[PDB]
Amino acid sequence: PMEEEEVETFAFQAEIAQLMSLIINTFYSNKEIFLRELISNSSDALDKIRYESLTDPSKLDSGKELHINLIPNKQDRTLTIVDTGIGMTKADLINNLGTIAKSGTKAFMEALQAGADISMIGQFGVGFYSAYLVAEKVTVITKHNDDEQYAWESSAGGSFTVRTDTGEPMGRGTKVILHLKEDQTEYLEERRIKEIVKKHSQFIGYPITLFVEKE
Numbered sequence: 592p593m594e595e596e597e598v599e600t601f602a603f604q605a606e607i608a609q610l611m612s613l614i615i616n617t618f619y620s621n622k623e624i625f626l627r628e629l630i631s632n633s634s635d636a637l638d639k640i641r642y643e644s645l646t647d648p649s650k651l652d653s654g655k656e657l658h659i660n661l662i663p664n665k666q667d668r669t670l671t672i673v674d675t676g677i678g679m680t681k682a683d684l685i686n687n688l689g690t691i692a693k694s695g696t697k698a699f700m701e702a703l704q705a706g707a708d709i710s711m712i713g714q715f716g717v718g719f720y721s722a723y724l725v726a727e728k729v730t731v732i733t734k735h736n737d738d739e740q741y742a743w744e745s746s747a748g749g750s751f752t753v754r755t756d757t758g759e760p761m762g763r764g765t766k767v768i769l770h771l772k773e774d775q776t777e778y779l780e781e782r783r784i785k786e787i788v789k790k791h792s793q794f795i796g797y798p799i800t801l802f803v804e805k806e
């Protein structure tokens with residue numbers, strides 16, 4: 592029996608599209624900061640469910656453990672960052688991952704063209720897009736309480752897709768899957784991941800575990 596699935600294809604907001612093009616087509620040193628930005632987003636999402644659970648403890652029915660998992664896969668060249676934070680509703684997803692303008696986008700692009708280090712991206716509220724420093728495609732799977740699980744994906748180029756995810760269920764949280772560019776495979780190495788977590792993400796207030804495939 593053939594299954595049918597609805598897909599929605601969206602255009603990035605004009606300046607977000609401009610920023611993504613600048614990140615992808617310009618050389619930057621210090622690309623390693625992409626992981627800091629993603630872990631920071633996870634930490635923020637974990638704070639959110641933690642505080643929400645104080646007013647409504649049943650919001651943890653979907654999983655009580657608050658943590659971050661890092662999963663490098665050298666076979667398909669993906670680095671996956673998974674958290675059990677609050678997750679995103681459909682509205683959160685579309686508004687936070689490309690359709691709604693961000694007030695910091697223009698300032699940051701001016702800063703970059705002026706020679707600013709790419710590390711400054713977090714300050715401007717668009718840190719997620721640093722993923723495209725190392726990834727040619729990014730897939731985001733997310734599950735918020737009382738909503739369905741959604742899959743967001745983009746290879747840049749001006750568009751992204753959103754669909755209801757019929758794949759493996761997450762209890763609650765967000766999974767960011769980085770399909771790495773061929774020259775950025777160092778971020779699949781255990782030593783390198785430990786290095787940049789130690790350097791940039793040492794004060795995160797939730798457990799982080801690195802899972803390393805044998806061999």
Ligand SMILES: COc1ccccc1-c1cc(Cl)nc(N)n1
Binds near residue numbers: 632674678679687719
């Ligand atoms: C505001 O949070 C985000 C902004 C941009 C991209 C992703 C996120 C996000 C949201 C949630 Cl609930 N979790 C995670 N890990 N990232």
